[PDB]
């Protein structure tokens, strides 16, 4: 069943379809609940900032950009779902092809360019299931919403504020995405996050989400220091670490390795894990981190948890392994936690800094 997807059904779909087309079909299948069938280990439960997560494996932003398949993503086994990026006004993104497969590297390059249905459409989609989500979140399945700016946009801070106001009420956490491959200084990021956090605080208590920043793996050491400073200063709720990389590590073998765009998957794994490690030390383990980048196995997840991530996201591994990947990562993560003498996931967060 997991062997069937990895060895036969998934390679066949890839052989028959352009990646963006296959992305669209995946979303359709998931939206209709056409999914295969592991559940409910108490070791895997984690309570980040008080909110409780049933397992720590979520679907990264970008797969369900417009909130069309949220329920089917929970049905796949994910412990939380993140949708987006959503831009305020609708925009078409970049011309096609804009998604490229690097199978020799177990990697993807994409330059979607924030194709977004827009805040209004996503709002209605989320409003159509708002009370369903309330009960889901209560039973350990929270929802996150990832916000972008429009490309023709004038005030970037205004775009993120609109997102906070329109979609903040529907979200358990919000993500200010400032790390798309397709900002000036520390004082500029302080001005943006201060506006975002102010709009957030103006929402009613039961509609007041956590606010996380999502950062690139391509930051200089000074950028990471600056983010860490502003994050602790302004009381940002967390970090998502990392987005895709505009770097092109050596030894990438795919023919399409020189396409412009963000590289995801295995070649990002350890670069992503080292940024977690770095951001966790700079914030004294005081800020929750969702680790994302190249994760496709228990060991990939545990390395990021030991590095300081309280939760992990994946995306690219789903395009190779199919929906069975979620069960696989969960099953392995529980086995290695035991093996290594951890009581649960919470016992392991940051365990590498002792
Ligand atoms: C095709 C594609 C589209 C993506 N779109 C977004 C996006 O809209 N917003 C965002 O914050 N990240 C986006 N991402 C990045 C993922 O959220 C994730 O950070 C990145 O792919 C690294 O994870 P992975 O190697 O497990 O896929 C996208 C990634 C891919 C591959
Ligand atoms: C194969 C695939 C998938 C994919 C295809 C099918 C399924 C699936 C979902 C539910 C049931 C059975 C299969 C999931 C993901 N997504 C993608 C998403 N974004 C970019 C690229 C891709 C690709 C790709 O061409 O590399
Ligand atoms: O083009 C996009 O929509 C996009 C791609 C990506 O890799 N990361 C991101 O934040 N946005």
CATH topology: TIM Barrel
Give the number of domains: 1
> Order of SSEs, N→C?
HHEEEHEEEHHEHEHEHEEHEHEHHH
Cα(first) to Cα(last) distance is 39 Å
Q: How can the largest sheet be summarized?
A: 8 strands, parallel, barrel
CATH architectural designation: Alpha-Beta Barrel
Total beta strand runs: 13
Shape: globular
Under CATH, the homologous superfamily reads Aldolase class I
Treating each run of at least 4 consecutive H or I residues as one helix, how many helices?
Answer: 13
CATH class: Alpha Beta
Compute the CA-based radius of gyration.
Answer: 19 Å
Structural class: alpha/beta
Q: Reading side by side through the largest sheet, how are the strands ordered?
A: 3-4-7-8-9-10-12-13
Bound molecules: flavin mononucleotide, the ligand Cc1c(-c2ccc(-c3ccccc3)cc2)nc2cnccc2c1C(=O)O, orotic acid
What percentage of residues falls in helices of 4 or more residues?
40-55%
Proportion of strand residues? 15-25%
Binding site for FMN: 61-65, 85, 146, 177, 214, 242, 265, 294, 315-316
Function: Catalyzes the conversion of dihydroorotate to orotate with quinone as electron acceptor. Required for UMP biosynthesis via de novo pathway.
Cofactor: FMN
Subcellular location: Mitochondrion inner membrane
Features of this protein?
monomer, 354 residues, alpha/beta, TIM Barrel, eight-stranded parallel β-barrel, three-stranded antiparallel beta sheet, 13 strands, globular, binds flavin mononucleotide, binds the ligand Cc1c(-c2ccc(-c3ccccc3)cc2)nc2cnccc2c1C(=O)O, binds orotic acid, oxidoreductase/oxidoreductase inhibitor, Oxidoreductase, oxidoreductase inhibitor, OXIDOREDUCTASE-OXIDOREDUCTASE INHIBITOR complex, monomeric
């Amino acid at each position: 069943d997991e062997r069937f997807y990895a060895e036969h059904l998934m390679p066949t779909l890839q052989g028959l379809l352009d990646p963006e087309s296959a992305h669209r079909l995946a979303v359709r299948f998931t939206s209709l609940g056409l999914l295969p069938r592991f559940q409910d280990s108490d070791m895997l439960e984690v309570r980040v900032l008080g909110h409780k997560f049933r397992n720590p494996v979520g679907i990264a932003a970008g797969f369900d950009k417009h909130g069309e398949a949220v329920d089917g993503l929970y049905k796949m086994g994910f412990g939380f779902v993140e949708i987006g990026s959503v831009t305020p006004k609708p925009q078409e993104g970049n011309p096609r092809p804009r998604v490229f497969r690097l199978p020799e590297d177990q990697a993807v390059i994409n330059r979607y360019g924030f194709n977004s249905h827009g805040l209004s459409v996503v709002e209605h989609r989320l409003r159509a299931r708002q009370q369903k989500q309330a009960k889901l979140t209560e039973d350990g399945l929270p929802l996150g919403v990832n916000l972008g700016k429009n490309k023709t946009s004038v005030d970037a801070a205004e775009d993120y504020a609109e997102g906070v106001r329109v979609l903040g009420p529907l979200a358990d956490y919000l993500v200010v995405n400032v790390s798309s491959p397709n900002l000036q200084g520390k004082a500029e990021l302080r001005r943006l996050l201060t506006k975002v956090l102010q709009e957030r605080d103006g929402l009613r208590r039961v509609h007041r989400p956590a606010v996380l920043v999502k950062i690139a793996p391509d930051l200089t050491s000074q950028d990471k220091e600056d983010i860490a400073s502003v994050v602790k200063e302004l009381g940002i709720d967390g970090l998502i670490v990392t987005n895709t990389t505009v770097s092109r590590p050596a030894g990438l073998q795919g023919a399409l390795r020189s396409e412009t765009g963000g590289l995801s998957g295995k070649p990002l794994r350890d670069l992503s894990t080292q940024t977690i490690r770095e951001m966790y030390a700079l914030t004294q383990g005081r800020v929750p981190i969702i680790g994302v980048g190249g994760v496709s196995s228990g060991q990939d997840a545990l390395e990021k948890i030991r590095a300081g991530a309280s939760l992990v996201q994946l995306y690219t591994a789903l395009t190779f392994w199919g929906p069975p990947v979620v069960g696989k990562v969960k099953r392995e993560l529980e086995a290695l936690l035991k093996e290594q003498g951890f009581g649960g996931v919470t016992d392991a967060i940051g365990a590498d800094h002792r």
